[PDB]
Design a protein around this ligand. Structure first.
Ligand SMILES: CC(C)S[C@@H]1O[C@H](CO)[C@H](O)[C@H](O)[C@H]1O
Ligand SMILES: [Mg+2]
Ligand SMILES: [Mg+2]
Ligand SMILES: [Mg+2]
Ligand SMILES: [Mg+2]
Ligand SMILES: [Mg+2]
Ligand code: NA
Ligand code: NA
Ligand code: NA
Ligand code: NA
Ligand code: NA
Lengths: 1011, 204
C-alpha cells in the first residue's frame, strides 16, 4: 500500500512517545548527565542512493548494498549533497494540492547502514532504534525484514528491533519519501528539503522499565515552598518488590527524596494504575527558574527492587517555576513577563536543516547578548538539544506542533475536517509527550497558519487536560479564537488597524480592550526583518512598556534562510529562492533574519538589542534615574559608565556601580560638569557594562545604553575675513569660478556643478545632481513581481508616477559677483509625461575662504506619491580608505530605525559604510549627521548620507550581492530628507505616516569645503 | 537682538541684504536668526529666515516676525485656513479657502486677553496695499502682544496706532487637555532645533 498517500496511516509499529531517555544503569552517571553506555549514536557514514519514485527502488536493496550508492554523512538533507534541488516556496504548496495524494515522481532516498550490535544487548532487554527527524515519511527494514513506518518530520520515530537483530553485523535500510500525506501538514515558509536530518540512535532498555515520567512543580502563595510531584509509569513485569525512588539534587547536594511501590490512587470503578506511581517531594525555599536566572535541580528517577537493585535510571533537569495567566496577565513565578522574543527556524547555510550543538549555542549566545529572553520554535518541534540548552542558558520557549497548512483554501480546509484530526492529534500529543518536562518550555502552540478548525478546539482542550501547567496559544483564524489562551497576532500594528474581513488585525492597543476581551496579547510574529527593515521597532516597545497586557512578542525572524552556492571559480555566494532551478519560488522571501545565515548581524540587530534593554533611564538635572525591568534578579553584575563629550570631544566620564533591585530604581547624581564656552552641543551617554563574564557573555559586555543632549552653546562667532575673492569667468556653456588652487565649474545647459578641482586634480566623475529616489528596499517592493505587479507597493507607485525616469528641466541658471563671493542660482523642474513632480531651487555661494555653501529648497507635488528621499548625489573621483563623521552611528541607521545609534564622532573603513544585504538595495545610511569627512572633502549641515562604491542604479539593478562590482570612484548620497524603511510587514505598505516625506516643501543646506 | 552681520550686495536684477542676529540672556545664546532679503525689479521683497534654537532652552511659543504697520485698513483678505481663529493643534474645523473679514473679526475678545486670532496654513495675506505670500500662520490686530500680556481684562485694551502684524513660520500648539499643567502635546512643540520659512512682501 501507498501508506504515504493516507492520512489515516501516520505510522506502523511505532513505539509510544516519551521524554528523553538514556537508560543509565548507574545512578550517579544519571545524576551527572554523563553519557550512557545504553544509548549509542548511529550518526556517521551511511550508504545512500537516490531514486525518482519509490517504484524505482530495486528489491535487492533490502538485502544488499547497491554498488552505485554513495557513502554520505548522516544526519543530512540530501538536497545539501546535490541529489536534487531544495525548493523555496512560501504559501503555495510545492506539490499540486490534491490531498491526500502526492506527485508520482516523488524523490526517494535509500539510506542504509551496516552496523554492529554487541551480544550483550541481545542477551536481555529491549533494543530500539530512534530516528529523531526523517522528512517526510519512511519505511524501515532491518536485516532485510520490514520493521515499520513513520510520518511527522519533526519528532522522533522509535521502533523495537529486538527481534530483528543478531550479534555482530546488521544492516538497516530506510526508504525516505520526499512527499507524503504528511506534507499537507508541513507547509511552513522555508526551504523544502528531505532526508534523515536529525540524529539516529540505538537504545537498550531493560524488559522491566520506566516507560514515561512527568515532573510537575507547584507552589505556595509566595513561592517559598514547593512540592515536586513525579508520576512514573513502567512497562514489563509488575511485581510487588518493584519501587521507584525520585531524588532531587542541587549540585552534589540531595535536597529531597521519596520512595514508593507501584500502584497509583484509585481513579475509577475499576481501580487505579497498578503500573504507575506518583512521588511527592517537599522542597523548602526552592531556587526558582527564569530566563534571568536559570536555576536548575536534577531529578533522578530510579526503577529498582525494594532490596536495592537498580534496574535502570532516567533523569531530567528540573526548573521550579509556575506559569499562569491571571487577571489577563501571563505571569512567571507570580510576576508579569515582558517577552523579548524571536522566532527561530533551524537553518544552516551549508547543512540545510541539520542542526548542531555549536550552531545552537552560537545562536543562544547571540540572542542573549542582544537582550532576547524568549524563542518561538517556528513552526515545529526542534532538535532535542535545543530545549536542554534553553533550560540551562535560560530562554523562555514556545514549543509548537508541526502543523501548517497555509496553502489550503480556505486555510482551515484540513483543520476543520474530522478526517485529519488523527494526523493532527499525533503532531500535538507526541510533542507534549516528549517535551513536557523541560522548564524552558512555557507555552504550547498548536501549529501555525492553518486557519481555525474544530480540530484545533479539540487539541487545545486535550493539552489543557493533560498539562494544566502551561497556557496554550494558537494564532490561526484571527489570533483570538477559542483555541488560544493568548491573543497572539502576527504583524498587528501598534496604532493602525488593518480590518480585514473575518480575520482583522486590530491595533494591538485597541485589541486588548474590545468588548468582553480580557486575555494578554503577545505577538507570535512582528517586525518582519527582511532586508533593510525593523523600521518602527521602537513604537512596539514603547507600547509594550506602557500597557500591562501588551506582553511583548517574537520578532520574525532570527536568521536568513540563505543557502551557499559556488561560482565557476569555486567561490561561495548566498543563494535564495529560485537559485536552484526551483520554481515556482518565492525569491528573497526566505531571508527575514536579524542575522545573516553565517550569524553575522544585520544592522537591525542593534536596534532590537537597544529597545529590548532591561534598564530604563530618565535624566533630571544631573540626576540619572535607572529603573530595572528585571523581575527576579538584582543588578549584581552591572556598572554604569557615563561620558560627556562636546561634539565628539570627550570632556568627562566616570563609572558608578548599579545596585538596583528587580523593578527597583536607583538615583545617580552626576558630578559638576564642564560648562564650556566653546561652541557645540554637549552630549551625555551612559552604558551598562557587565564587569564579570557569564555563561553567555564576556567580561565587559555592554547590555544597555542611552544618550541625552545636555547644554548647547550655539556658535555666534564670526568667520575671519578672507584676503581673496573668487573670480568668475563665463561662456555660453559654463560658469567657472576660481579661487586659489580651487576651481568650480557649473554647466549652463544642465544647471549643475559638473566639476571641481583641488589643485589641478578633478574631484567628480559625475555631476552633483538632485536625487528623489532610492534603490528599493525589500519593503518597498513587497510582493510586487514583473509577472504580477502590485500597484499599491511603494516601488510601483514611484514607478508609475515616473520618479525613476523623470528628467530635470532647467528653468534658471545665473551667476552673480558679490563683494566677497560668487553666487550661482539655479532652478530645475522634474517632470514626467506632462506632470511636474518636483521643483529644486538652489544657491551656491563660493566665498574667499574656499567654501561652497549650498542652499536647496524643493517643492513636491502633493498628488505625486511621497518620494523616497530629497537629496543630492554625485560620483566622487577619489576612493579613500576611511569615512569620518559627526552624527548617528556607528552602524547603518534610518529615520524609523535610529534609536540605537548614538551621536558621536565615528571613523570606519569605507567598506563598513555598505551593508551587504543579500538582495541589494539602498543601504548604509547614517542620519543626523553634522559633519562628514572623506579624503580631502568635508561636508557640514544637518543631513543623512551614504557613501560606497555602488551606485543606486547598480544596486537597483542587481539581484544578488555577489554580482555587485565596485564602480570607479565613490558614490555619495547626501540627503536633506529620507523616507522611513518600514517593515511592520513586508507585503504591504508599512512606512508610518510620520516617516513619509509629505511636507510639500523641503529645505536643507550644506557647506562643502576642503582640508 | 545682538547683530552679528549686516551686508548688502547688488546682483544683476536685484539687491540682496544679508543679516544675522543672536538673542541672548545671562550670556547664553537662545536663538540665532539668519536672513536674506532680496528686492527685485518687480518690487517684490523675498525674505528668507533660518533660525537656530538652542536645544536646552524651553521650546519657544513661536518663530516669526512682527511689526507695527502704520496704516489701518477695513478688511483682511487671505487664502489659507479659516474663517475663524485657528491654531496648530486646533485647526481641523477650519477650511482652506479665500476669506475676507473686517479687521475686528481677526481679534478674539477672550475676557482675559492673550495671543489670539491666529490663522494657520496661509499662503497669501492682503491688508491695505500690502500682500505677503508664503506658507505661514498670522495674526493681525490693533493690539501689540505686549499690551495683551500686560492687560487683565479685555475692556481695558486700547487700539494702538496702526496695525500689529505677527507673521509666523511656526507657532506652538495651545494645549488644553487641562489648564493647570503643561498640556501641549510633544508634536505641537517647536523642538526641531533649526527652522526655515520664507515670505514675499510686495505691493498691491
Ligand atoms: C506574504 C504574506 C501573505 S504571508 C507571510 O509571509 C511571511 C514571509 O516571510 C512569513 O511567512 C509570515 O509568517 C507570513 O504571514
Ligand atoms: Mg500516511
Ligand atoms: Mg540511592
Ligand atoms: Mg546474561
Ligand atoms: Mg506560512
Ligand atoms: Mg515566484
Ligand atoms: Na506590557
Ligand atoms: Na519568509
Ligand atoms: Na552591580
Ligand atoms: Na536590488
Ligand atoms: Na493678558
Amino acid at each position: 500500500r501507498r501508506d504515504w498517500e493516507n492520512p489515516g496511516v501516520t505510522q506502523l509499529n511505532r513505539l509510544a512517545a516519551h521524554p528523553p531517555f538514556a537508560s543509565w544503569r548507574n545512578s550517579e552517571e544519571a545524576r551527572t548527565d554523563r553519557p550512557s553506555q545504553q544509548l549509542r549514536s548511529l550518526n556517521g557514514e551511511w550508504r545512500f542512493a537516490w531514486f525518482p519514485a519509490p517504484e524505482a527502488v530495486p528489491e535487492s536493496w533490502l538485502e544488499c548494498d547497491l554498488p552505485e550508492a554513495d557513502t554520505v554523512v548522516v544526519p543530512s538533507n540530501w538536497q545539501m549533497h546535490g541529489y536534487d534541488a531544495p525548493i523555496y516556496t512560501n504559501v503555495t504548496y510545492p506539490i499540486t494540492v490534491n490531498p491526500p495524494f502526492v506527485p508520482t515522481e516523488n524523490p526517494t532516498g535509500c539510506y542504509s547502514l551496516t552496523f554492529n550490535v554487541d551480544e550483550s544487548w541481545l542477551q536481555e532487554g529491549q533494543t530500539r532504534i530512534i530516528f529523531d527527524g526523517v522528512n517526510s515519511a519512511f519505511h524501515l527494514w532491518c536485516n532485510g525484514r520490514w520493521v515499520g513506518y513513520g510520518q511527522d518530520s519533526r519528532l522522533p520515530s522509535e521502533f523495537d528491533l529486538s527481534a530483528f537483530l543478531r550479534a555482530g553485523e546488521n544492516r538497516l535500510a530506510v526508504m525516505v519519501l520526499r512527499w507524503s500525506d504528511g506534507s499537507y501538514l508541513e507547509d511552513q515558509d522555508m526551504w523544502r528539503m528531505s532526508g534523515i536530518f536529525r540524529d539516529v540512535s540505538l537504545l537498550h532498555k531493560p524488559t522491566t522499565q520506566i516507560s514515561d515520567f512527568h515532573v510537575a512543580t507547584r507552589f505556595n502563595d509566595d513561592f517559598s515552598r514547593a512540592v515536586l510531584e513525579a508520576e512514573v509509569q513502567m512497562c514489563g513485569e509488575l511485581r510487588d518488590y518493584l519501587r521507584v525512588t525520585v531524588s532531587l539534587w542541587q549540585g552534589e547536594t540531595q535536597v529531597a527524596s521519596g520512595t514508593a511501590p507501584f500502584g497509583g490512587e484509585i481513579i475509577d470503578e475499576r481501580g487505579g494504575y497498578a503500573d504507575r506511581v506518583t512521588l511527592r517531594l517537599n522542597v523548602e525555599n526552592p531556587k526558582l527558574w527564569s530566563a534571568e536566572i536559570p536555576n536548575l535541580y536534577r531529578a533522578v528517577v530510579e526503577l529498582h527492587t525494594a532490596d536495592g537493585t537498580l534496574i535502570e535510571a532516567e533523569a531530567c533537569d528540573v526548573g521550579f517555576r509556575e506559569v499562569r495567566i491571571e487577571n489577563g496577565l501571563l505571569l512567571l513565578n507570580g510576576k508579569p513577563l515582558l517577552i523579548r522574543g524571536v522566532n527561530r527556524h533551524e537553518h544552516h547555510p551549508l547543512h540545510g536543516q541539520v542542526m548542531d550543538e555549536q550552531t545552537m549555542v552560537q545562536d543562544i549566545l547571540l540572542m542573549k547578548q542582544n537582550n532576547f529572553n524568549a524563542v518561538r520554535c517556528s513552526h515545529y518541534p526542534n532538535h532535542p538539544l535545543w530545549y536542554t540548552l534553553c533550560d540551562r542558558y535560560g530562554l523562555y520557549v514556545v514549543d509548537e506542533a508541526n502543523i501548517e497548512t497555509h496553502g489550503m483554501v480556505p486555510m482551515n480546509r484540513l483543520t476543520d475536517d474530522p478526517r485529519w484530526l488523527p494526523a493532527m492529534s499525533e503532531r500535538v500529543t507526541r510533542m507534549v509527550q516528549r517535551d513536557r518536562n523541560h522548564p524552558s518550555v512555557i507555552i504550547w502552540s498548536l501549529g501555525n497558519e492553518s486557519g481555525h478548525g474544530a480540530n484545533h478546539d479539540a487539541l487545545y482542550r486535550w493539552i489543557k487536560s493533560v498539562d494544566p501547567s502551561r497556557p496554550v496559544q494558537y494564532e490561526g483564524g484571527g489570533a483570538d479564537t477559542t483555541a488560544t489562551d493568548i491573543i497572539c497576532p502576527m504583524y498587528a500594528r501598534v496604532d493602525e488597524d488593518q480590518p480585514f474581513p473575518a480575520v482583522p488585525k486590530w491595533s494591538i492597543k485597541k485589541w486588548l480592550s474590545l468588548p468582553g476581551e480580557t486575555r494578554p496579547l503577545i505577538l507570535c510574529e512582528y517586525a518582519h526583518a527582511m532586508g533593510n527593515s525593523l523600521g518602527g521597532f521602537a513604537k512596539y516597545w514603547q507600547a509594550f512598556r506602557q500597557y500591562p497586557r501588551l506582553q511583548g512578542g517574537f520578532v520574525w525572524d532570527w536568521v536568513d534562510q540563505s543557502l551557499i552556492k559556488y561560482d565557476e571559480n569555486g567561490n561561495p555566494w548566498s543563494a535564495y529562492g529560485g537559485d536552484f532551478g526551483d520554481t515556482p519560488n518565492d525569491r528573497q522571501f526566505c531571508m527575514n533574519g536579524l542575522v545573516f545565515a553565517d550569524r553575522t548581524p544585520h544592522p537591525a540587530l542593534t536596534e532590537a538589542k537597544h529597545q529590548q534593554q532591561f534598564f530604563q533611564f530618565r535624566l533630571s538635572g544631573q540626576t540619572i534615574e535607572v529603573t530595572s525591568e528585571y523581575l527576579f534578579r538584582h543588578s549584581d553584575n552591572e556598572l554604569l559608565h557615563w561620558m560627556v563629550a562636546l561634539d565628539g570631544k570627550p570632556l568627562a566620564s566616570g563609572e558608578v556601580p548599579l545596585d538596583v533591585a528587580p523593578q527597583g530604581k536607583q538615583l545617580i547624581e552626576l558630578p559638576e560638569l564642564p560648562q564650556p564656552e566653546s561652541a557645540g552641543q554637549l552630549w551625555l551617554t551612559v552604558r551598562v557594562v557587565q564587569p564579570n563574564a557569564t555563561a553567555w557573555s564576556e567580561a565587559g559586555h555592554i547590555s544597555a545604553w542611552q544618550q541625552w543632549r545636555l547644554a548647547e552653546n550655539l556658535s555666534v562667532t564670526l568667520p575671519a575675513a578672507s584676503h581673496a575673492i573668487p573670480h568668475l569667468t563665463t561662456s555660453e556653456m559654463d560658469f567657472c569660478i576660481e579661487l586659489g588652487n580651487k576651481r568650480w565649474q557649473f554647466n549652463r545647459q544642465s544647471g549643475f556643478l559638473s566639476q571641481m578641482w583641488i589643485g589641478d586634480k578633478k574631484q567628480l566623475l559625475t555631476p552633483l545632481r538632485d536625487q528623489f529616489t532610492r534603490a528599493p528596499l525589500d519593503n518597498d517592493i513587497a510582493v510586487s513581481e514583473a509577472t504580477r505587479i502590485d500597484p499599491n507597493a511603494w516601488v510601483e507607485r514611484w514607478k508609475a508616477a515616473g520618479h525613476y525616469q523623470a528628467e530635470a528641466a532647467l528653468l534658471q541658471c545665473t551667476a552673480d559677483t558679490l563683494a566677497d563671493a560668487v553666487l550661482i542660482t539655479t532652478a530645475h523642474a522634474w517632470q514626467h509625461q506632462g506632470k511636474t513632480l518636483f521643483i529644486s531651487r538652489k544657491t551656491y555661494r563660493i566665498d574667499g575662504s574656499g567654501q561652497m555653501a549650498i542652499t536647496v529648497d524643493v517643492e513636491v507635488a502633493s498628488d505625486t506619491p511621497h518620494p523616497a528621499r530629497i537629496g543630492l548625489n554625485c560620483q566622487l573621483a577619489q576612493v579613500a580608505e576611511r569615512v569620518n563623521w559627526l552624527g548617528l552611528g556607528p552602524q547603518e541607521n534610518y529615520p524609523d530605525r535610529l534609536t540605537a545609534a548614538c551621536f558621536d564622532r565615528w571613523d570606519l573603513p569605507l567598506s563598513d559604510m555598505y551593508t551587504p544585504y543579500v538582495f541589494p538595495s539602498e543601504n548604509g545610511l547614517r542620519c543626523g549627521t553634522r559633519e562628514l569627512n572623506y579624503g580631502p572633502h568635508q561636508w557640514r549641515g544637518d543631513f543623512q548620507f551614504n557613501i560606497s562604491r555602488y551606485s543606486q542604479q547598480q544596486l537597483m539593478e542587481t539581484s544578488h550581492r555577489h554580482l555587485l562590482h565596485a564602480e570607479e570612484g565613490t558614490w555619495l548620497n547626501i540627503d536633506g530628507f529620507h523616507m522611513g524603511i518600514g517593515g511592520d510587514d513586508s507585503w504591504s505598505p508599512s512606512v508610518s505616516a510620520e516617516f513619509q516625506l509629505s511636507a510639500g516643501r523641503y529645505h536643507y543646506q550644506l557647506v562643502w569645503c576642503q582640508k
